[PDB]
Write a protein that binds this ligand. Sequence first.
Ligand SMILES: CC(=O)N[C@H]1[C@H]([C@H](O)[C@H](O)CO)O[C@](OP(=O)(O)OC[C@H]2O[C@@H](n3ccc(N)nc3=O)[C@H](O)[C@@H]2O)(C(=O)O)C[C@@H]1O
Length: 268
Amino acid sequence: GIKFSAEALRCHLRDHVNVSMVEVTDFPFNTSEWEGYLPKESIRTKAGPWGRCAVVSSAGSLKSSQLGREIDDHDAVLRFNGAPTANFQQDVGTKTTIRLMNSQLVTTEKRFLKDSLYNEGILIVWDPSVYHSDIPKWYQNPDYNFFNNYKTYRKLHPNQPFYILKPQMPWELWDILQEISPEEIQPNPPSSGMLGIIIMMTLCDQVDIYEFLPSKRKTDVCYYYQKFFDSACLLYEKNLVKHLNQGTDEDIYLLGKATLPGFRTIHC
Ligand SMILES: CC(=O)N[C@H]1[C@H]([C@H](O)[C@H](O)CO)O[C@](OP(=O)(O)OC[C@H]2O[C@@H](n3ccc(N)nc3=O)[C@H](O)[C@@H]2O)(C(=O)O)C[C@@H]1O
């Protein structure tokens, strides 16, 4: 089992994980090649602070969940990668406030530069670095070289806020996942879902998380918008979220809903 309490784990996350974006003052994003590309205003001036927020997993158990009104009844909603609301609004809601994407999508998915779903809300892209790398070292060897398509999207959509997560943040979170499950952890970075939860805990007083912990609807379907199975179709991440959950067991089983307090509200 996990050795620390929920209250202590929340404080450890607040203190060890630096939720911040690459800034125009971080070398080499202050080079002439990068001038004008990054947002100059912090995400904290575009995003909140908010009272009640939703994080919507991309899990297949959202299909037929009819969670759309529950999700939309929030100040802000975060979604992941290419997860759509169109044709699914009754299950997953209509609002998209923040969309967190991995660098694989930005680098290799041609629809990133074509599909209008990406044009709504605030965008964040993240890329897994080598563990313990700083920004200059990471820049020389990203997991996916997403920088060109980032720049292209910025030019096509200059007034949509589009941030890059600092590379240190996923591994800081990994450190805490290892503390709580050292014998089971894999040397892969946390999932986008886990990152998005921590991001919303930084911007919100209360974070409701839908179908990250499995509900009655647990299914073989990997993602709610999947049309069939292919090569496209975590345990310690779920245990962390369960450990921090303030909601009822009934909310998990029926609504697939966990509720986590935001960092602004905890006492350390
Ligand atoms: C084939 C593949 O690469 N799948 C990965 C996809 C894929 O790269 C993107 O959709 C871009 O195409 O990205 C991930 O997955 P993705 O961002 O799509 O999914 C969002 C988050 O929902 C949670 N989830 C999803 C499915 C499921 N059955 N259970 C879940 O709990 C996870 O927390 C997940 O992160 C990712 O970024 O994390 C991780 C996935 O492994």
